[PDB]
Amino acid sequence: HPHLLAERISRLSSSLEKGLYERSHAIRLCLLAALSGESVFLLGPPGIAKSLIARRLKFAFQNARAFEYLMTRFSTPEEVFGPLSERLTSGYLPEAEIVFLDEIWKAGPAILNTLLTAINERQFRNGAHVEKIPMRLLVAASNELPEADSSLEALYDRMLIRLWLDKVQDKANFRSMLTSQQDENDNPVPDALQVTDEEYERWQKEIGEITLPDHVFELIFMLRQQLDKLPDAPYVSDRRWKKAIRLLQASAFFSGRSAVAPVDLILLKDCLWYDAQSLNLIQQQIDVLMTGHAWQQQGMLTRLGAIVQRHLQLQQQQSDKTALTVIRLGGIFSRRQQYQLPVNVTASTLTLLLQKPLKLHDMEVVHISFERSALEQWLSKGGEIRGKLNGIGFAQKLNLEVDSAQHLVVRDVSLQGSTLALPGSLPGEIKQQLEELESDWRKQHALFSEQQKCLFIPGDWLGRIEASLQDVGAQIRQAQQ
Numbered sequence: 001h002p003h004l005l006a007e008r009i010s011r012l013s014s015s016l017e018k019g020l021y022e023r024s025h026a027i028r029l030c031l032l033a034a035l036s037g038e039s040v041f042l043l044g045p046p047g048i049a050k051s052l053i054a055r056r057l058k059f060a061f062q063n064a065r066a067f068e069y070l071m072t073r074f075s076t077p078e079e080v081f082g083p084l085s086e087r088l089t090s091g092y093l094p095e096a097e098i099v100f101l102d103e104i105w106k107a108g109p110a111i112l113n114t115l116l117t118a119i120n121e122r123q124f125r126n127g128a129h130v131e132k133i134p135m136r137l138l139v140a141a142s143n144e145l146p147e148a149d150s151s152l153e154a155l156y157d158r159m160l161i162r163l164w165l166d167k168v169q170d171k172a173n174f175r176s177m178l179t180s181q182q183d184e185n186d187n188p189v190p191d192a193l194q195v196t197d198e199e200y201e202r203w204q205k206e207i208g209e210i211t212l213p214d215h216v217f218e219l220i221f222m223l224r225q226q227l228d229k230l231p232d233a234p235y236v237s238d239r240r241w242k243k244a245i246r247l248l249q250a251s252a253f254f255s256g257r258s259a260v261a262p263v264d265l266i267l268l269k270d271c272l273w274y275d276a277q278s279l280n281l282i283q284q285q286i287d288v289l290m291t292g293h294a295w296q297q298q299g300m301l302t303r304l305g306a307i308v309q310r311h312l313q314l315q316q317q318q319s320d321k322t323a324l325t326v327i328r329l330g331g332i333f334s335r336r337q338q339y340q341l342p343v344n345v346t347a348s349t350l351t352l353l354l355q356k357p358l359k360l361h362d363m364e365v366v367h368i369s370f371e372r373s374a375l376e377q378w379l380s381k382g383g384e385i386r387g388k389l390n391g392i393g394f395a396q397k398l399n400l401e402v403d404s405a406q407h408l409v410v411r412d413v414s415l416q417g418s419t420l421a422l423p424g425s426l427p428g429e430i431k432q433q434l435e436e437l438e439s440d441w442r443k444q445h446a447l448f449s450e451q452q453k454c455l456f457i458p459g460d461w462l463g464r465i466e467a468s469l470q471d472v473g474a475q476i477r478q479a480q481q
């Protein structure tokens with residue numbers, strides 16, 4: 001039933017989107033805002049359908065009056081809210097469900113103040129008595145952002161969603177928009193889809209009942225702390241956070257869920273920035289949160305390395321079972337030449353464990369990886385041989401010698417020797433742990449795919465998450481070989 005809802009909202013949004021190019025997200029967000037009692041600020045140059053998409057949204061509702069107004073510096077509350085005879089509000093802001101106000105940052109202090117009470121109190125001072133405004137969606141537009149310490153910032157910071165728009169970029173889209181016979185002022189929404197007053201009011205109550213899971217909160221709180229520590233990060237007030245949380249709830253509700261999901265958190269990318277520099281910072285931070293923490297990605301990778309560590313540890317604990325017998329090569333040469341095993345060892349770079357781990361280059365080393373090519377020439381021509389300690393870092397020079405028993409022995413600064421062994425020809429402890437992790441990964445991936453079907457999230461983000469989960473899965477599958 002709420003799953004028929006996700007179907008309906010999607011179908012509703014689809015129709016509202018007809019004839020509009022490169023504005024999909026913007027329409028879904030304004031719909032989400034309109035259905036959740038939030039407001040949205042549209043930033044961009046003139047003639048890019050900012051007003052149009054605002055007028056479009058009145059067609060989401062059966063009974064919905066729209067109010068449009070362009071702010072001038074000489075604009076008075078009489079023009080915006082109605083002139084008093086007590087006040088004549090018919091055809092003005094005080095009785096419209098969708099209000100669009102263009103060129104917002106030039107509203108005077110008198111308008112500014114009565115707007116702030118309009119957004120907060122959903123009330124209006126009608127001379128004598130105060131009356132509740134039916135305003136469901138407010139949308140404000142401008143080509144610029146308000147001044148640094150402006151009066152208007154209080155208004156800006158009271159408008160949850162921020163969208164930065166531009167002229168159509170795709171050549172094909174330009175042509176389609178250019179030749180579109182779509183009457184832009186006609187109702188494109190089928191009667192059945194339009195939301196009723198009875199529905200609107202019920203949903204307002206139900207959105208508040210959507211739960212906020214522990215992991216979801218932890219992520220939000222993590223980001224709040226993260227932003228705080230970064231000096232460039234925009235200041236996000238508690239007011240902003242609370243209003244952002246309702247949008248998150250609304251997203252979930254209209255996506256057929258009873259709980260805010262980690263995917264809903266992407267929407268914060270449309271709430272937390274106030275300028276250009278802060279937009280980039282927000283996007284990066286949320287991206288890091290989404291690809292790293294939201295589906296336990298980095299947490300599973302830190303578990304993975306812990307297992308791979310144990311695997312190596314068990315590999316060197318069973319390194320008595322193996323040594324490495326270098327085969328003598330005869331012929332006619334000046335040195336006692338040596339040879340690697342014909343095809344037994346053919347790995348381009350092979351790693352060798354040591355029976356007695358040694359302190360080499362101020363660290364204890366359990367395994368040394370050689371470029372097989374470099375080990376060849378040293379076994380033949382002698383000289384000096386390098387090898388990356390514990391597989392990592394630079395190829396360090398080594399005190400290596402061919403043993404009488406035909407083994408390879410590394411020495412430390414105490415001249416302590418250690419025989420080198422090749423890895424085993426998968427232990428039960430590792431198989432158990434690595435299967436638990438794979439199960440956990442599958443459960444994570446399952447959760448993501450079962451929730452990525454979310455109207456209010458742009459496709460590109462979902463791509464990045466899916467990739468980040470594939471990365472972990474690939475790393476674990478390579479670990480079980």
Ligand SMILES: Nc1ncnc2c1ncn2[C@@H]1O[C@H](COP(=O)(O)OP(=O)(O)O)[C@@H](O)[C@H]1O
Binds near residue numbers: 022
């Ligand atoms: N991205 C777009 N998609 C569809 N139509 C557009 C787009 N950009 C501009 N238009 C056209 O421009 C007009 C709407 O512009 P308008 O609402 O005045 O924009 P703004 O409010 O940003 O000045 C319509 O006639 C519409 O067909």
